[model samples]
Target: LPAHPYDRLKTTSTDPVSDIDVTRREAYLSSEEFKEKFGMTKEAFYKLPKWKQNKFKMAVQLF
Candidate 1:
């Protein structure tokens, strides 16, 4: 995956790039439950433009 939206802060972690943790994010993106709901995969999500991904990351924070 590309650098997360929060990469500018220099936070360190293989999981949980932004404020959102990897466990939750992965569940929402990769788990069977959310995969069917969102109709998208983590790979496909990362394929989006950085701005788009950033916007998505920001929006997801509200959920």
Candidate 2:
């Protein structure tokens, strides 16, 4: 994962090619209280129906 999903962007809104630091690129997507968020793996999560995925994502995002 790209730490935060926002990291997937190639450039900042104002700048071309964001200069985000290497360490800043790594962050926990969730806390211990929010385990298995995003299903740990895409396949594990993607296997669910679209509605299920939305629900899962909503629960995870709450963290």
Candidate 3:
């Protein structure tokens, strides 16, 4: 017989929520290259609709 294969495995680690964002939050977002296409900065970036946001997300990759 095969050993039981557990599904939905879960594990725990030290707290991580603060560490990811507190570390500067720039997983991919940037200002210089961002401005090159969107011509916008951090705060202004958040002002637009998500549909328009995708426009930047799509173009950002081609660069």
lDDT of each: 0.42, 0.38, 0.40
Stretches > 4 Å off in candidate 3: 1-27
lDDT of 3 by residue, 1-63 (tens): 111111111122232332343222221334554455466775676577767765654554411
Candidate 2 local Cα displacement, residue 61, angstroms: 1.2
When 1 and 2 are scored with lDDT, the better candidate is 1
TM-score of each: 0.38, 0.40, 0.42
Off by over 4 Å in 1: 1-39
Range of the 10 consecutive residues with the lowest summed lDDT in candidate 1: 3-12
Best by TM-score: 3
Instruction: Give the per-residue lDDT of model 2 (tens digit) for 1-63.
Output: 323332332222232323444322211232322234454454555466867655665554421
Relative to the unseen true structure, what is the C-alpha lDDT of residue 1 in candidate 2, on a scale of 0 to 100?
30
lDDT of 1 at 4: 37
